[PDB]
Amino acid sequence: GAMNSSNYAELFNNDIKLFVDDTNVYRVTVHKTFEGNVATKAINGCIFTLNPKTGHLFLKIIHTSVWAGQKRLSQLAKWKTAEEVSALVRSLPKEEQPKQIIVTRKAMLDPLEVHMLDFPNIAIRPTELRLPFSAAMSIDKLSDVVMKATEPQMVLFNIYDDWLDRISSYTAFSRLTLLLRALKTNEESAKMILLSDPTITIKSYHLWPSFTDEQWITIESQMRDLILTEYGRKYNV
Amino acid sequence: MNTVPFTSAPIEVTIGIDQYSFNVKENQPFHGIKDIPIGHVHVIHFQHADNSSMRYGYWFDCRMGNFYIQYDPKDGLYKMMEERDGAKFENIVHNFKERQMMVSYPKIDEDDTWYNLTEFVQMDKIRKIVRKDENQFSYVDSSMTTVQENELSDPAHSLNYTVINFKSREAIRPGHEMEDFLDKSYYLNTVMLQGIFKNSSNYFGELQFAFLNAMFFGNYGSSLQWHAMIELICSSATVPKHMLDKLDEILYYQIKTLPEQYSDILLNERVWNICLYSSFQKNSLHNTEKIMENKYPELL
Ligand SMILES: CNC[C@H](O)CN1CCCC1=O
Numbered sequence: 185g186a187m188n189s190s191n192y193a194e195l196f197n198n199d200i201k202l203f204v205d206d207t208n209v210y211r212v213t214v215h216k217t218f219e220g221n222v223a224t225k226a227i228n229g230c231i232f233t234l235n236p237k238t239g240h241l242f243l244k245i246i247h248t249s250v251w252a253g254q255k256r257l258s259q260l261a262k263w264k265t266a267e268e269v270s271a272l273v274r275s276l277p278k279e280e281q282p283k284q285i286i287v288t289r290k291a292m293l294d295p296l297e298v299h300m301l302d303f304p305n306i307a308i309r310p311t312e313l314r315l316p317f318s319a320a321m322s323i324d325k326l327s328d329v330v331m332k333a334t335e336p337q338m339v340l341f342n343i344y345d346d347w348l349d350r351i352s353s354y355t356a357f358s359r360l361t362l363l364l365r366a367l368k369t370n371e372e373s374a375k376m377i378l379l380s381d382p383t384i385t386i387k388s389y390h391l392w393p394s395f396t397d398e399q400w401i402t403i404e405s406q407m408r409d410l411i412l413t414e415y416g417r418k419y420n421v
Numbered sequence: 422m423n424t425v426p427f428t429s430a431p432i433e434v435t436i437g438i439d440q441y442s443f444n445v446k447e448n449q450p451f452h453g454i455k456d457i458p459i460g461h462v463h464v465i466h467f468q469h470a471d472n473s474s475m476r477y478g479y480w481f482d483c484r485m486g487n488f489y490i491q492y493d494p495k496d497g498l499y500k501m502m503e504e505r506d507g508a509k510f511e512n513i514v515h516n517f518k519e520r521q522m523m524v525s526y527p528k529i530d531e532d533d534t535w536y537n538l539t540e541f542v543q544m545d546k547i548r549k550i551v552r553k554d555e556n557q558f559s560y561v562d563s564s565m566t567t568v569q570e571n572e573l574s575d576p577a578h579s580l581n582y583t584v585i586n587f588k589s590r591e592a593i594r595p596g597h598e599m600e601d602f603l604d605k606s607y608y609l610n611t612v613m614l615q616g617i618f619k620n621s622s623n624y625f626g627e628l629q630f631a632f633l634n635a636m637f638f639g640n641y642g643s644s645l646q647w648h649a650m651i652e653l654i655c656s657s658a659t660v661p662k663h664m665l666d667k668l669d670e671i672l673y674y675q676i677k678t679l680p681e682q683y684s685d686i687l688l689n690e691r692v693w694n695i696c697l698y699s700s701f702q703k704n705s706l707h708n709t710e711k712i713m714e715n716k717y718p719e720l721l
Pocket residue numbers: 546549550581582583617618619623624627
């Protein structure tokens with residue numbers, strides 16, 4: 185059934201599973217037309233498919249040409265997401281295929297179930313967690329590859345960089361969700377925290393800065409402050 | 422007109438015959454039902470006075486044999502049986518009529534209700550759904566499960582209806598996933614109508630039989646089947662016009678006949694609101710929508 189605070193440690197056991205987040209698949213800007221009506225212009229999107237144990241991210245870039253001539257794009261986006269996830273699974277060797285796929289939005293359940301009918305033993309699950317994966321496009325390197333794409337493309341990343349050399353996947357996921365929650369609540373502040381000190385750089389093959397253990401504790405504490413603050417700035421407390 | 426005699430009525434029971442019913446007291450001198458219209462299937466059904474649990478009954482067609490009812494004190498129920506000695510049967514019936522020990526099938530001349538509820542229901546199809554090939558009549562009761570319910574336990578006592586499942590490979594063509602899930606026309610017209618049912622008459626007959634088993638026996642799996650068969654049509658964008666017109670009539674008479682007090686358990690809010698107000702056919706069931714809005718506006 186649904187994934188929640190109670191069964192949270194299941195994410196870090198040895199059953200292969202993937203989170204799928206579709207919130208950045210169909211992206212638009214809204215603008216005025218010369219006649220003063222409103223129109224949308226699509227921009228490139230991405231499916232965010234993440235193994236929370238290993239950090240492997242399958243970033244399927246959605247080029248705006250896929251929407252050309254199509255109607256009801258928000259509905260189509262869910263089915264396109266399920267089509268691409270199903271194609272990813274079929275592309276993986278049997279021993280790499282997931283045993284569960286957890287969708288971050290319940291509207292993905294039926295599209296993914298229908299696309300995965302060939303895989304009756306892969307469980308499709310919702311979650312009660314309010315995960316911040318929409319903020320993935322606030323990670324500069326991910327946003328850059330999505331916006332530069334001229335055609336459909338899949339790009340592989342490790343969203344944990346090398347953290348698993350020193351910390352557990354439970355702890356790595358907690359750091360990831362804290363960073364992303366911060367970036368979602370106040371992107372400018374979060375990004376200032378991460379890059380303030382110019383002596384700490386991002387390796388070419390990494391997404392985040394090369395913090396020491398002690399610096400991650402400081403960083404993590406600065407993100408928590410940010411989140412509580414904005415939670416006041418928002419609710420006045 | 423045909424007759425179903427009763428050997429006797431040893432236990433107090435409410436007897437149904439089609440949409441009619443009457444009470445018989447313990448050891449009351451009751452010897453059956455006469456004037457049963459030829460040309461239709463019929464159902465004779467029972468609810469004991471002591472155990473309202475298990476409604477049960479028998480689908481039959483008097484053109485197929487001479488049938489009678491006899492209580493079995495070991496199995497504790499009224500059983501339908503066939504009399505092969507046609508002379509013994511005519512003699513029995515004539516004696517019971519002369520002694521006026523039979524109730525008359527109480528059909529009003531104007532009244533087409535039973536025809537309208539059984540228009541497409543055939544005894545040959547009912548016997549394939551309910552298997553006991555040695556009898557020409559078919560037993561059904563409140564507890565019997567469907568093949569589909571069993572997949573999700575005795576197969577001899579099952580209802581063999583066609584299994585309808587919108588999230589199944591049978592329903593969804595590879596590469597048409599979104600198309601086939603949001604518009605079920607493929608599944609209705611090619612899978613269910615042409616390769617399984619064979620024509621819309623077999624389809625409607627199974628849909629009518631499922632409703633009648635839900636209404637008369639409270640058979641839950643039959644109710645599931647009835648709603649699935651409605652929803653498959655309403656969720657198809659491409660339906661033959663004659664089928665939509667006939668469905669509106671079928672459902673109108675079903676809703677008309679439903680006991681006002683059982684609508685809470687026999688009508689699925691989600692299916693009906695979807696079918697009448699969201700589906701491709703939301704504007705195609707005028708008679709059904711009108712009676713539903715005037716009889717059960719709460720459900721909607
Ligand atoms: C006994 N199962 C039969 C299914 O429910 C519908 N079918 C199959 C062929 C003709 C017909 O009416």
